[PDB]
Amino acid sequence: SATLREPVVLPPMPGEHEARAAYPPIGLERSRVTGGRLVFDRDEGFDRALAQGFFLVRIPEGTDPAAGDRFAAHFHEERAGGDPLDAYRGYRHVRVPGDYQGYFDREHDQWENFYVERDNWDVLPSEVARVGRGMAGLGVTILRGVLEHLRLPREHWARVTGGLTEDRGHQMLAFNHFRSHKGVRGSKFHRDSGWVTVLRSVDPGLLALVDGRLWAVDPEPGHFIVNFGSSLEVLTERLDRPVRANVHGVVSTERAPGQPDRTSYVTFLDSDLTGTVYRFENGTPRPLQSVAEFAGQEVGRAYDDSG
Ligand SMILES: CC[C@H](C)[C@@H]1NC(=O)[C@H](CC(C)C)NC1=O
Ligand SMILES: O=C(O)CCC(=O)C(=O)O
Ligand SMILES: [Fe+2]
Numbered sequence: 001s002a003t004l005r006e007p008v009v010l011p012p013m014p015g016e017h018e019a020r021a022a023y024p025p026i027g028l029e030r031s032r033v034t035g036g037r038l039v040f041d042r043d044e045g046f047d048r049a050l051a052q053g054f055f056l057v058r059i060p061e062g063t064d065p066a067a068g069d070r071f072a073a074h075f076h077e078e079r080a081g082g083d084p085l086d087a088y089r090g091y092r093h094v095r096v097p098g099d100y101q102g103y104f105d106r107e108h109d110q111w112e113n114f115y116v117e118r119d120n121w122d123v124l125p126s127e128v129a130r131v132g133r134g135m136a137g138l139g140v141t142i143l144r145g146v147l148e149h150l151r152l153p154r155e156h157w158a159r160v161t162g163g164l165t166e167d168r169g170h171q172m173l174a175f176n177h178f179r180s181h182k183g184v185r186g187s188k189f190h191r192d193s194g195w196v197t198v199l200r201s202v203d204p205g206l207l208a209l210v211d212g213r214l215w216a217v218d219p220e221p222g223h224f225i226v227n228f229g230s231s232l233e234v235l236t237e238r239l240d241r242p243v244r245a246n247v248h249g250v251v252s253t254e255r256a257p258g259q260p261d262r263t264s265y266v267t268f269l270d271s272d273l274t275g276t277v278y279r280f281e282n283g284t285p286r287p288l289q290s291v292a293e294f295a296g297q298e299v300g301r302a303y304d305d306s307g
Pocket of ligand 3: 190191192248
């Protein structure tokens with residue numbers, strides 16, 4: 001396959017406590033959307049963020065995470081009965097049509113997921129879908145800002161991003177509940193499959209694996225964490241400034257009785273799943289692989305799933 005990239009040895013995932021002091025945090029560049037575009041605080045911040053593959057972006061004022069935070073804390077629970085909050089529960093029993101969508105009980109990971117692409121956001125409380133709309137819209141603006149910063153000619157963008165820069169593509173809100181009762185890794189070490197991931201988290205536990213070094217990626221109040229995905233990496237790997245999709249994963253979280261579990265949620269921006277994966281070679285975006293086969297490949301690596 002033309003999109004494999006070179007092998008990455010994945011170490012066992014450390015426990016939360018031992019990781020907390022052993023692996024110091026990456027220093028992330030800060031940025032915000034202002035004047036209608038992504039702007040970094042520091043003059044070389046954009047270049048450093050593309051090289052780092054992680055950075056921070058201010059939560060835009062029109063995006064209030066509150067409803068998403070509440071949904072993330074409850075979606076995995078059984079309905080209580082006679083309880084208004086049940087509107088935010090029971091989603092392990094909610095079917096969502098489409099590949100890679102719906103509820104997932106990951107056998108070998110702490111997390112269980114509820115994944116909903118934008119065309120299916122009516123299955124969510126409207127106020128929760130509204131958070132996904134703000135995060136995904138931010139993610140598209142960031143993607144536009146990246147491709148402009150790379151000076152990639154705009155005539156290519158809609159094709160090579162499978163519609164994302166035209167606000168189409170596969171835009172997926174993803175809720176994670178880390179089941180602290182499971183004595184395994186929080187997640188597998190993985191690359192995200194797509195272009196730009198916007199991550200809402202408040203707790204430590206995310207690690208970056210970079211050329212055999214483990215470093216923490218710590219959230220910052222009032223900001224999202226942003227990283228890049230394998231589709232952007234493959235697109236740019238032969239260019240003079242390649243963009244890195246970092247390998248990352250969540251520690252085996254540790255919670256005593258009564259301590260709330262870790263949660264997080266993201267918007268993944270993937271190419272349209274009927275499209276093609278491209279790589280710039282000799283100025284031209286070369287078609288390498290269908291997005292369908294690429295997705296199956298990348299999802300197959302990101303989880304240890306016998307089905
Ligand atoms: C690849 C693994 C990571 C955690 C995440 N999981 C998914 O299922 C989607 C699949 C995409 C093709 C819609 N993308 C992602 O980045
Ligand atoms: O929970 C986190 O900090 C990261 C989650 C993540 O990597 C993912 O959802 O793909
Ligand atoms: Fe991820």
